[PDB]
Amino acid sequence: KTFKQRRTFEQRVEDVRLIREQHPTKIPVIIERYKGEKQLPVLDKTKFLVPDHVNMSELIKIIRRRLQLNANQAFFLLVNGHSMVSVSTPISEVYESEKDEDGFLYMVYASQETF
Numbered sequence: 001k002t003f004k005q006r007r008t009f010e011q012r013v014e015d016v017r018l019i020r021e022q023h024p025t026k027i028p029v030i031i032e033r034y035k036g037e038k039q040l041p042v043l044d045k046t047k048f049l050v051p052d053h054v055n056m057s058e059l060i061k062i063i064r065r066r067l068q069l070n071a072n073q074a075f076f077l078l079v080n081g082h083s084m085v086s087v088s089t090p091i092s093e094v095y096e097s098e099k100d101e102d103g104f105l106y107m108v109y110a111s112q113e114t115f
């Protein structure tokens, strides 16, 4: 079901290396709904190429737009399994500290803070 379950470690590593070659200014992001999630819809895709200058606050706005949320629906985004310390950090900086060993940046969203 999950991205990591669908693709071999070798396949995930090779895909990140191709994004490096073909979209060298983009961060490779996996964005998945919490397996428990009742309220929020599923995204149309899993793998996103994020411009490396956008900060986490803007990425949250981007995902809220893509999910077509309204103003009062709650949305919580985990990065690398945990809460974001700050939304002001450029994703280039978040990537260097929070990247997976495969080279993807993993995010999960839910309508509750309690995942």
Ligand SMILES: Cc1nsc(N(C)CC(N)=O)c1C#N
Pocket: 016, 017, 018, 020, 021
């Ligand atoms: C480490 C690394 N990052 S990008 C890359 N490319 C372009 C593909 C490849 N497998 O040669 C490598 C390697 N090595």
Ligand SMILES: [Cl-]
Pocket: 022, 023, 024, 025, 026
């Ligand atoms: Cl690019």
